[PDB]
Amino acid sequence: DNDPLVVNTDKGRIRGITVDAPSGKKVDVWLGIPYAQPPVGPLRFRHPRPAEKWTGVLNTTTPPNSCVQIVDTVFGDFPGATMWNPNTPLSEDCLYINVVAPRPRPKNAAVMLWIFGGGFYSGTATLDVYDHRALASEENVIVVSLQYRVASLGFLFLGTPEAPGNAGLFDQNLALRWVRDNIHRFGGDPSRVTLFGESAGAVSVSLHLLSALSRDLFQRAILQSGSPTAPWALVSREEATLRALRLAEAVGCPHEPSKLSDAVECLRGKDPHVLVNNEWGTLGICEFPFVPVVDGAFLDETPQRSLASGRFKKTEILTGSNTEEGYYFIIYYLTELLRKEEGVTVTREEFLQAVRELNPYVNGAARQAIVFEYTDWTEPDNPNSNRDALDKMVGDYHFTCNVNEFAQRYAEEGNNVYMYLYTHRSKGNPWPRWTGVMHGDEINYVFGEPLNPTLGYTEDEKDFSRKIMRYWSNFAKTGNPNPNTASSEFPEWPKHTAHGRHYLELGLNTSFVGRGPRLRQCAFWKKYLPQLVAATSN
Amino acid sequence: DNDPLVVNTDKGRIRGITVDAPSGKKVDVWLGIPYAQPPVGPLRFRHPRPAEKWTGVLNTTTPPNSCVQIVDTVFGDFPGATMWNPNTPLSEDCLYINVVAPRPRPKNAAVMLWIFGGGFYSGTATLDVYDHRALASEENVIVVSLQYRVASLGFLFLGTPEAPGNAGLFDQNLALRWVRDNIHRFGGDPSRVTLFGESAGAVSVSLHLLSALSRDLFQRAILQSGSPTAPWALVSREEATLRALRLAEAVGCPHEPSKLSDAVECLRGKDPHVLVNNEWGTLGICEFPFVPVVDGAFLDETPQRSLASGRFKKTEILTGSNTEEGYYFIIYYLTELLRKEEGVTVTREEFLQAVRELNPYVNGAARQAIVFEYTDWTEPDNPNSNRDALDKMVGDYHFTCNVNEFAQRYAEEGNNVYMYLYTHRSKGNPWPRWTGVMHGDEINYVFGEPLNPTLGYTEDEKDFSRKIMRYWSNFAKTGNPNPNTASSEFPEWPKHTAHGRHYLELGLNTSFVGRGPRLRQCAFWKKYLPQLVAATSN
Ligand SMILES: *[C@@H]1O[C@H](CO)[C@@H](O[C@@H]2O[C@H](CO)[C@@H](O)[C@H](O)[C@H]2NC(C)=O)[C@H](O)[C@H]1NC(C)=O
Ligand SMILES: *[C@@H]1O[C@H](CO)[C@@H](O[C@@H]2O[C@H](CO)[C@@H](O)[C@H](O)[C@H]2NC(C)=O)[C@H](O)[C@H]1NC(C)=O
Ligand SMILES: *[C@@H]1O[C@H](CO)[C@@H](O)[C@H](O)[C@H]1NC(C)=O
Ligand SMILES: *[C@@H]1O[C@H](CO)[C@@H](O)[C@H](O)[C@H]1NC(C)=O
Ligand SMILES: [Co+2]
Ligand SMILES: [Co+2]
């Protein structure tokens, strides 16, 4: 065909469509490309099979079905909560890819590949926050995104072939293989694939750097507020086996570790919606029932041992955190304290009880170390500072410091690292003004949501999106976010070197280069408190 | 006599002398006024008796004998060390008072009463650094000072009547009773006696607020680098007996706790220089062999209990610290490392060894907390930063944090407190460059030593001296260092209130107002580490 919209993929022909960006610059899109067999019936829980080849021309004009997942209804139809809720029908047949190329169609352009986040229980590529048209057109890159299986449906583990674990990661892996085989046909370069993700998506990106099966499938990596050394990122084979049995028990299935065939058989027979709804039992803050696991094929060691020994992809990294990571998770957890309303505060007594609840696995002498490290000693009983203390202890432990470990371990092995601290509140932010720069706020600006003027983003926010979109794309192209010839509009992002630990603050009216971020609080979590538990355990 | 230089005291007459203050201005001085029977022979170690009345007119014109103590000759003749050594001849007959009045002679002026410091083992009022002429003449106040017994001669305890303890403080108490009975005859107000001291002199001054015996002998208090809850300020009455028995053992006297009369008798017979030069056995950093004790008369409870209950004088307080309180004591103690020379530094392993030797009583799980709290996580193995960390751990624990606690409890019992942080180096400081603003560095400036034209102080340093001399004298006069009308050259010193905890930075080119200072580091020593040791120690 002389038509550019039709593209001969390795398994068949697909017809795309030309779509207007919100900027007014046209782009070619291909939405809902089948990259794998629908994991249905006996294929549930297992690793994906490549899609059966088709005869004729399939129209890839519609956003695909999202994977079966729970829906966030705790705050009803609250725009800040519902923006992450899935916007396409929930189906087990969710294994699809979306490609968006700029106009005119490039030759061998840099490929930016988005892997979504939702604590490995939720999320989808089809959300409007992940719109590719801005990032593609404004920066001249092939923006790609994929669906992977989430929750128990993508991460059930029993230490058996029929529930081998990491099925969601192998979904991502098979998509990376697809991009390598086919993205050149859409105007991309297979050798310049940059993986970028947020939260569990950023964790996923880090596991792809560590893993052997995906070591030769991409080039560079961006990691927004996530890393493979996070407490929640992985779970042990011993605990993962028990939770699958708990799921079977809760759903009404045979749930004995002696005979594990009977459990999976009926689990595959159950409705996928009742399966996901009965996952959440008694779990603490920021720990998710079904997440990645050290299986043997994808990963054959814990990410710490890979990181300690130095066994990871020798490539550039761009990573970072936000100032208020914890609040989002302490909103959904701790519901009675921290209500979704304006001007909430925490009294010292309420703060003292929260460290017990937010850290239920630590002795008591360790809990004394936590109350000292996270206290505003200028005004110890300040209701606003005590609320802030809760955000930081959760945010540092579960996100910021784990990004720092990963980034610092990449630095002192020779690779160039570029750390950010995202410090900006959107002017019309639906959440309370005390919540600050929450986990996932950066996403709105990296994907060019302010360039859509039908949303009421300011002029400086539009300039700020254009600013960080360049850093992201510049890095994906050449391995440096910095421009070729420096500018006042585009300040210097220095390397996060091992000896220096520098980072660039990302905000409206700044270019402040700090060091860390928050090295003392991370030193607490990663060095001090571990040996304090080791000392006081006996 | 209508001659003004003579004054008929309660025990006789004395004649003073007119002399020039270094500046050029003229003052009346009365040097070596006896206030006690020489504590000689039977009266050694016991509390002082008042002076026997004399006939005629005593020529009170020569500076008094310094009390028996050791001479600092580890560095030989280093000007920075020899300035604290005694400049008048050593004698047991040392219980004298100095009075210096400005001209024209006032009528009912504020009395600024100086108590010196030397770890309760050393010091004298006659030192050229404590030059009263400049202060008196510049601020129009009656500057008074006194000689109190130091070392074992001043503070020996065996729990007997013949060695009751606190003789040095009872010397000060009697000296305060003299100033109350007599200072109206020199032109001073007995009701406006403001005590002021540094190091152990500030401790002394602080205990006078606590004490029942000296409660009604003065008005206000100024406290430089000192506090009654300092670890070195007092020792236990249990320990202090053992200290005396070890001193008796060293000199060759009976050291049997069953028979204490033979010990004190034998000790009374020995030469006073033998006694002082055999006190320093195996004592760690910032802990002195003979210091104050809870006796029953001067103090009938520990300073911590009196602060717990609010049992102290209801008045104003002007207290503070310097930035580098520790180095001075880390130079003399621990001399193999950190020696007296330019550009010295401490490596990580030397820091790790230093924390063991500067805190040898803690259990090791506590050492991990100290190293964590006093390491620069920006650059953990920086030799400069590891050195400064040693200054702080000693400077905080022994000085800064006890000053803060005393100011805090005062502030939150409704008293008007004023906190400072002295941050200024003399331009011609003989000590090394790395030492910074060391312990007792402010004394030269509060006493008006920069106004001496034979010395080479800068004109900015002369202004800075006149600046703080005004604050001090304003406080002594009114209970507030800030001037009435609020001058532009004199910045606002806000009250160190219980809620805010504001302190003024005292430097050349700064009027910076902070919080604390070092509240986080003081919460470590006073809040966290105490409950750690109790958690860990079995
Ligand atoms: C989309 O697929 C459908 C069916 O698989 C096709 O839709 C038709 O194609 C042409 C497009 O100009 C028109 O006749 C109608 O829109 C549809 N007619 C019929 C008979 O199906 C088509 O192959 C694909 N879309 C396009 C734009 O080619
Ligand atoms: C210091 O004391 C002396 C002796 O009590 C005072 O009297 C002087 O005594 C000497 C004898 O050594 C006579 O030569 C002088 O004439 C006396 N001096 C005066 C001024 O009368 C002496 O007055 C006292 N010192 C001062 C400065 O008055
Ligand atoms: C913010 O920008 C303004 C000029 O637009 C300028 O004052 C400065 O760069 C920033 N403001 C500060 C640092 O107060
Ligand atoms: C204090 O420092 C500032 C720096 O901005 C300078 O302008 C000023 O001249 C300094 N003060 C004096 C008295 O020199
Ligand atoms: Co059962
Ligand atoms: Co013996």
Curated annotation (Swiss-Prot), chains A, B:
Disulfide bonds: 67-94, 253-266, 401-522
Catalytic reaction equation(s): acetylcholine + H2O = choline + acetate + H(+)
Transmembrane annotation, as ranges: none
Principal location: other
UniProt keyword terms in alphabetical order: Disulfide bond, Glycoprotein, Hydrolase, Neurotransmitter degradation, Serine esterase, Signal, Synapse
EC number, UniProt record: 3.1.1.7
GO BP terms in the entry: acetylcholine catabolic process; choline metabolic process
Top EC class for this record: hydrolase
Glycosylated position list: 59, 509
Reported impact of residue 119 to S: In strain: YAO; confers resistance to insecticides
Positions annotated as active site in the UniProt record: 199 (acyl-ester intermediate), 325 (charge relay system), 439 (charge relay system)
Keyword Signal: yes
GO molecular function: acetylcholinesterase activity
Cell compartments where the protein resides: Synapse
A single GO cellular-component term on record: synapse
Function: Rapidly hydrolyzes choline released into the synapse.
Family: Belongs to the type-B carboxylesterase/lipase family.
UniProt protein name: Acetylcholinesterase
Lineage of origin: Eukaryota, Metazoa, Ecdysozoa, Arthropoda, Hexapoda
Covered residues, full protein: 162 to 699 of 737
